[PDB]
Amino acid sequence: NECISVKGRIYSILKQIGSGGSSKVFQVLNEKKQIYAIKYVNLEEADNQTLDSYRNEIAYLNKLQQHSDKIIRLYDYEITDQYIYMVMECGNIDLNSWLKKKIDPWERKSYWKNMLEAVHTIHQHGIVHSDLKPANFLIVDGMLKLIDFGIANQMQPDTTSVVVGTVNYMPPEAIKDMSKISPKSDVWSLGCILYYMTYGKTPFQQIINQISKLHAIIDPNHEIEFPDIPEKDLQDVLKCCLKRDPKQRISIPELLAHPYVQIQTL
Ligand SMILES: COc1cc(N2CCCC2=O)ccc1Nc1nc(NC2CCCCC2)c2c(C#N)c[nH]c2n1
């Protein structure tokens, strides 16, 4: 029965999808019984940094949905000094949750097109995400749609039996730069996702120790395995995305002219 009004519309809370720092996301129904997601942010306590991060996400979300429908839509929002409410397109599920249920080749290359389109358009407006991973994409309408820009607070799914970030998607440049960053590091992370989507695992999901994992990612003399497969253009895509040198890695504009994307059958 718990409810939320935003501007002058009432919405019913079916459940809570997820939560993060000071944020919650709810699955809700509007008055005419249509389904939406609402993100809630409690601003009561909040640095001037995160305030600006939350303001920055809303503006980019509003700016970017005009240019692609592979970005989750922001329909309405309400922002005061105390709270934010954001009424948004509601996904069926996030791609990370879904991948952990163990893909038709054609759904896989359609999803890939979806991700490139979304990441390409945020690149055209000056954003490099930097921490792309499956959780950033939502399945809706049989498509993948991007939900974050790396900018704001990364939330996590709520379970109903209560229970930690991943690192399998981090590009080599990010690691070696602990001692601005390229559009090319989003290519790395997308390759890991596509790799996962094709070989059932991320390129270093075996190295269960995390510092030896970090070293593999950066190691020139540590080969990534690309088992032969029927779709050889999919093999090529993975090979070029997962080049360690960002300068030699394939770019998004190149990926969009690649045969895996352009020739429509396997
Ligand atoms: C019923 O919908 C879902 C269900 C589930 N899950 C996961 C496992 C079990 C389950 O049911 C996952 C996502 C959705 N849909 C959905 N989630 C969103 N956020 C989640 C938060 C936690 C991290 C992922 C993204 C948003 C959003 C924002 N911000 C704008 N629109 C959205 N839509």
Span from the CA of 91 to the centroid of ligand 1 (angstroms): 6
Q: How many helices (H) and strands (E) does the chain have?
A: 9, 10
CA 206 to centroid of ligand 1, rounded, Å: 28
DSSP, collapsed to helix, strand or coil, labels residue 163 as: coil
- Give the pocket of ligand 1 (CB within 6 Å): 17-18, 25, 27, 37, 39, 72, 88-91, 93-94, 97, 135, 138, 147, 155-157
Distance CA 62, CA 15 (A): 25
**Rounded-to-integer distance, Cα 122 and Cα 94, Å:** 19
**Residue positions in the annotated binding site for ATP?**
17-25, 39
Ligand 1 nearest-atom number relative to CA 37: 31
What's the sign of the alpha-carbon dihedral 170, 102, 263, 126?
negative
Structure tokens at 28: 């809700």
* Distance of alpha carbon 144 from alpha carbon 167, whole angstroms: 21
Here the tokens at position 107 are: 């759904």
Interior/surface letters 183-221, b for 16+ CB within 10 angstroms, e for the rest: bbbbbbbbbbbbbbbbbeebbbeebeeeeebbebbeeee
Mutate to test the pocket of ligand 1, among 6, 14, 17, 132 (most ligand atoms within 8 A of CB): 17
From the candidates 47, 81, 94, 131, which is the catalytic residue? 131
Cited resolution, angstroms:
2.4
Place of tokens 């890991």: 192
Beta bridge partners of 137: 146
Three-state DSSP class for residue 240 = helix
Question: Is 131 part of the annotated catalytic residue set?
Answer: yes
| 53-to-56, 118, 150, 164 alpha-carbon distances in Å | 5, 20, 10, 22
Helix (H) or strand (E) holding 263: none
Structure tokens at 197: 């989507």
Q: Domain ranges in the chain?
A: 4-92, 93-266
Helix axes 232-241 and 105-124, enclosed angle (nearest 10): 30
